[PDB]
Design a binder for this molecule. Structure first.
Ligand SMILES: C[C@H]1O[C@H](O[C@H]2[C@H](O)[C@@H](O)[C@@H](O[C@@H]3[C@H](O)[C@@H](O)[C@H](O)O[C@@H]3CO)O[C@@H]2CO)[C@H](O)[C@@H](O)[C@H]1N[C@H]1C=C(CO)[C@@H](O)[C@H](O)[C@H]1O
Ligand SMILES: C[C@H]1O[C@H](O[C@H]2[C@H](O)[C@@H](O)[C@@H](O[C@@H]3[C@H](O)[C@@H](O)[C@H](O)O[C@@H]3CO)O[C@@H]2CO)[C@H](O)[C@@H](O)[C@H]1N[C@H]1C=C(CO)[C@@H](O)[C@H](O)[C@H]1O
Lengths: 598, 598
């Protein structure tokens, strides 16, 4: 028995406050009844389906049912219950199920969708500002480090020494001046690491949430960037560091720059914004003395960060700043009493305050772990998709993982992993998952591949074609490598002699295909083949199809069975050297290929 | 490769604010390292494990690690990461995993446990008061029904006519007078259907939340029951109906008994406690005109139901009532604006208010569906376990399901279903899941079995030995049958000529074994065999073991491989006619057996 359904047209259609749902079946012993099992205000309903008279494709039977949109919550969850006289079988995002699927692992469509619809149209670029570009027209003591900061010329090797204290002097005007490069790359949106006043180079040790650090050009340079990006039709996301402050923040003031710091004054207005021993000594947070954790048990703190009208979260989302969203640093540990108590409520409060100021604000969190409980409760829009995208590819392609432990997973396991994760997410959620290969917090993926660096182009193609929004970590596109923090923060090589121009061109081309084809931005996704070295999946949107074939190993041929999803007029190869003929994929060694239908 | 771990002693031990975690492995190609992957304030940690010098059982290698209890949230989640030079493998509640388990499907132990610890020690009994017992010393118009209520003598057949309007006259003093019967049955706790003033016989159409209905004996009879149960060491749970009110409630007052009813007065104090059209006509709730839904958007309603000190939820939990908890009717749909919007927050508010009045209050909800999102967010203590217990047995034993659709599932599928569901729950949560075979809302299980009614004793034994608290639906124990509502609410047969005394005796014996053996109340649970007709599982607690074998089909023999969990001095058969000798289970047809170790 075979079945097909994706939570997108041609399988679903909205008409006059009804959501029409279509299922495809094929086989010799087809069920004489099918029930659409759909939820309405968390109650399970058994909606009848009826057999369509016309076969949508050869050998396929279509069943159709209807979800009433006038009642119920925006997220429409459903699965299919196949019924014979003596038995039943469920059809789900994870193929067939003999017992009922988890309620939170059904197909799901958000209708009406109140999420940030612009995200699916973006190509993001992540910039660590000190290391990207110095503007054309262009030392103090770091108390938490115990020594003055260090200045380095752009071509000086990056070392393990003075990791959080070494500045190459990149700034926000440098970004503005490189907008033509980024535009040519096909970037439409920027995610910046922290820019607010802070003593370190990474600035996760925030000293002032209301002022841009002068080292990066201060307030005027961020305003210029907001103007220049808007002018070029680009989105701009700031790093929101609300789990903790820096220990030079005036609220805390460990090195006693002034008065009323919480660290040394029991009567400080911010004393209950932090955690102290019974004797009144400030607790460190996880060995990090420089990053004291904020205590969201305090109502006055909640008001400062997100609760009030001029809270921090809302401040940078209104004029004159008008930023497009927040990436939430340490989204999973923020909470009360020194740990994650009530974490979900505080993340939801942040997101709600952001959307109050700016309805289409994009709020997404740094989740190295499993983000599904956060996303299934709608406390944020999206997550940095380490568990659903990054680590599956680190395993399948680079034989390693979050802990840099060895991994040996084949194609079957990789795609079971990736499909299981997104089964927990609505289609609209899947399309805005923040996908990337590495970050300021990981070793460079090019490094992790080691002897198999020839696989790097496969990951780039995958980055732009899996459901979700792709994010390029600055320098990835010209071949920058290096180990984990501090060595993943190399200065960008603007000398073309030091750039991998062939890799740059592949990024450019992939962004071109994504902008050109609706299925790469809105489409459903069906894995058609996954065995050993080869993954084949199709993106599906209305009548259009995008086929992707990835082969991590030696040259091979793969027979692709007849699928009603592949029943098109014909295929046009757009990228890669693969070839498709009469159901046979001829795949060169270490290759990825992309076809468009018709 | 083989592995063993249960989230209970002998596998875990608390010592000086550390939780020691032990894993058992066996095989020819054992991993040279194992990492305890444990979460602390939602951050994933890689805690090293070390090989113990002594083999706990023959051919078994033990690895040990430590979770620090001084930091982190009460729920301690963990899994095991087996490591070879080139590869890894995860060990989870659902056996081995090739890619990381879901964060919410790991092993989990609540330490410190602030849940209701008395629940695991209980045997519950559910009473529908009109139909249980009439007290020794012993008609109006039902507006929502359109006709006067009906009186029936105890021996008159139950019919489909006047379903919610027919009274056999059972009352709360009748319950008091049958406490000796219930005590002999081994009942320690009562769950009552609604008792507050209401026109119908089931009383889910609440008219006054502050008064016991006089038909059941009014306030004085409930007080006598609270006294008599307390005297006999029994717990008492009331039905909390907070999703909706009755349409004769004074807040709503459809039939205009007085003034200021919301239904007909736009200026009523309760107008925004319900949903009206733009023209001011009261919306029905799901076809039910008699059950208008409460709008928790209203702050004044929140205060009435749970927010204030003398809210309804807290009112019956303090003196003089001092009830032990609430069963929450329609827990999944309660919310704002006419649907389930913000359902999770309002259920959490109810539970919090209950525990504020009474720290060990037990609050659990009626979940016909998948309750895991509710339980994984701790918004209630437990759920009526239809998805994790009831419907798996309806499938495996009675070939049917929630929708009375045909089911054909074998033992493998049944136990995959039951084990997958509880993998989402901590051990402490698993032990208080509210397990039963049928209710006032389902057909009687004895009926559902049809031609296979000889399987009924298997379900009873299972009811008392699966993790969770068992609940007997009144009359189940003497063989009462019948179809779904109204026919599942038969008057209890106190004539012994009409009772199945052999079935009654089995219930009595099973409650005796549960009270006698710690593993049936606190123990972990490991499925040892599940194939076709036969399920074999072991409850495990410290050095004690309870083995259970269930055979739904013909007589057979099953070979039970050597397990370090079964390595005991010997086994004593306590119930059933099964026999265990040199690893061979001889199982009679349609049988369940229970052994105690040593
Ligand atoms: C002192 C450090 O501050 C920064 O790191 C913070 C920051 O809030 C965030 O990057 C956080 O990162 C991750 C996740 O929260 C975790 O889920 C995941 O398991 O681990 C990630 C990285 O740990 O980590 C810090 C808060 O926990 C800054 O980015 C760092 O560079 C740190 N600065 C120092 C630190 C060292 C040695 O620890 C130096 O080598 C480094 O070069 C400096 O920049
Ligand atoms: C009018 C009815 O009131 C009661 O039923 C309510 C009640 O709040 C609760 O029992 C609820 O039950 C279940 C769950 O909430 C659902 O998750 C699940 O899918 O379905 C369950 C049962 O529907 O159902 C009602 C609120 O939805 C009372 O128990 C019932 O007996 C009803 N009273 C009438 C109804 C009919 C025909 O509908 C008569 O045959 C019956 O004998 C009467 O008592």
């Amino acid at each position: 028995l075979k079945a097909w359904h994706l939570p997108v047209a041609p399988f679903i259609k909205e008409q006059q406050e009804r959501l029409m749902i279509t299922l495809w079946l094929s086989g010799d012993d087809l069920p004489p009844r099918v029930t659409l099992r759909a939820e309405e205000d968390n109650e399970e309903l058994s909606l009848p389906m009826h057999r369509l008279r016309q076969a949508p494709h050869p050998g396929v039977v279509a069943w159709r049912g209807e979800i009433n949109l006038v009642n119920g919550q925006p997220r429409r969850r459903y699965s299919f219950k196949l019924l014979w006289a003596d038995r039943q079988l469920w059809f789900t995002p994870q193929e067939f199920n003999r017992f009922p699927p988890a309620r939170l692992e059904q197909f799901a469509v958000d209708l009406p969708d109140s999420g940030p619809q612009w995200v699916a149209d973006q190509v993001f670029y992540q910039i660590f500002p000190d290391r990207f570009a110095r503007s054309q027209s262009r030392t103090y003591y770091h108390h938490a480090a115990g020594h003055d900061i260090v200045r380095k010329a752009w071509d000086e090797p990056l070392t393990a020494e003075a990791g959080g204290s070494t500045f190459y002097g990149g700034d926000l005007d440098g970004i503005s001046e490189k907008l033509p490069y980024l535009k040519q790359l096909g970037v439409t949106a920027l995610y910046l690491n922290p820019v607010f006043v802070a003593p370190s180079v990474h600035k996760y040790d925030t000293e002032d949430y209301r002022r841009v650090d002068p080292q990066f050009g201060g307030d005027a340079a961020l305003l210029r960037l907001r103007h220049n990006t808007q002018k070029e039709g680009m989105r701009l996301i700031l790093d929101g560091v609300f789990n903790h402050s820096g220990d030079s923040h005036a609220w805390f003031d460990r090195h006693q720059r002034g008065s009323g710091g919480a660290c040394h004054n029991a009567d400080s207005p911010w004393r209950d914004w932090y955690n102290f021993s019974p004797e009144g000594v400030a607790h460190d947070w996880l060995g990090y003395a420089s990053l004291p954790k904020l205590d969201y048990r305090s109502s006055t703190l909640i008001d400062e960060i997100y609760g009030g009208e001029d809270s921090v979260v809302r401040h940078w989302l209104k004029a004159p700043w008008s930023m497009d969203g927040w990436r939430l640093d340490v989204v999973h540990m923020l909470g009360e009493g020194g740990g994650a108590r009530n974490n979900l409520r505080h993340i939801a409060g942040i997101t709600q305050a952001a959307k109050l100021e700016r309805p289409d604000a994009f709020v997404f969190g740094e989740h190295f772990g499993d983000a599904r409980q956060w996303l299934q409760a709608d406390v944020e829009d999206s997550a940095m998709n380490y568990r659903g995208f990054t680590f599956p590819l680190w395993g399948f392609l680079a034989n390693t993982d979050i802990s840099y432990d060895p991994q040996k997973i084949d194609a079957q396991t990789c795609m079971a992993w990736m499909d299981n994760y997104r089964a927990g997410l609505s289609h609209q959620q899947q399309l805005r998952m923040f996908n990337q290969l590495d970050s300021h917090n990981t070793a460079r993926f090019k490094s992790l591949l080691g002897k198999d660096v020839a696989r790097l182009p496969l990951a780039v193609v995958w980055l732009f074609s899996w459901p979700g929004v792709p994010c390029i970590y600055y320098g990835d596109e010209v071949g920058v490598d290096g180990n984990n923090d501090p060595f993943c923060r190399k200065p960008f090589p603007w000398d073309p002699a030091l750039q991998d121009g062939d890799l740059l061109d592949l990024y450019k081309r992939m962004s071109k295909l994504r902008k050109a084809h609706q299925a790469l931005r809105y489409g459903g996704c069906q894995v058609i083949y996954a065995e050993d070295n080869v993954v084949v999946f199709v993106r599906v949107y209305k009548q259009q199809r995008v086929l992707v074939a990835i082969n991590r190993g030696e040259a091979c041929e793969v027979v692709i069975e007849d699928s009603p999803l592949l029943d098109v007029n014909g295929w046009q190869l757009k990228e890669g050297a693969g070839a498709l003929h009469d159901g046979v994929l001829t795949l060169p060694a270490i290759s990825a290929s992309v076809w468009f239908s018709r």
